[PDB]
Amino acid sequence: GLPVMNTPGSNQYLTADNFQSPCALPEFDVTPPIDIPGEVKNMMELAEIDTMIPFDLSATKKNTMEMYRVRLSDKPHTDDPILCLSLSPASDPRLSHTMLGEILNYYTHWAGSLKFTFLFCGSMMATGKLLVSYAPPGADPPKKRKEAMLGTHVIWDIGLQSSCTMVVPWISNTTYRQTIDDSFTEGGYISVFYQTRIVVPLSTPREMDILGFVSACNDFSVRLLRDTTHIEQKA
């Protein structure tokens, strides 16, 4: 009956293949699903939830609480960066672990605008203005307020509304960027400077710390799944 012909690619198993296969337990009455609070329909949903960036990764402060507290002081106004960061929501050790940056390793191409949210964690009295800035790639990274200022910045203010968010608009030469430290698909440069200085009244803690959070925006998306370098199975 019916003359058929086995085609190049027969008897071939393909891990990510999708073909119907005989059922081991025929008839097994499956248990009805309840309505568990908190479903998730797509990974990029998780990508839109802020996760604190471990900004400091100094041999001493790494792998320990001190790693997320970016300390600011009441030092006389300077023009040097109080944090840097290579926009590589996958590559840069600073982002490589945050939910966003943790999901980004299970992929080969990320895209869309990101949103860094900074929380001033210090004495209700302390005030000041911090300039959070981004400058697309291909130019000397910014090391002075004078140079960073020229790029895309949001001159934030430490007040009642305790937090800010500088959206990093998706400005890139390709439709997606390599989720590996590739030179052609470079990310850009993020960097917060003091626009004034954190001024405090007498009898106040002179060294308050800021915590940074990061997340994707309803634009972001990833593609071509892979195995995260993050966890190894020794032997």
């Binding site: 050790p93 490589s96 430290d181 590739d182 030179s183 052609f184 370098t229 993050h230 190894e232």
Partner: peptide, 17 residues
Amino acid sequence: SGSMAVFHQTQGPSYSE
């Protein structure tokens, strides 16, 4: 996993510091 200095056959050196 975080790699320090890396030198790619093309992209050249890649100093983590």
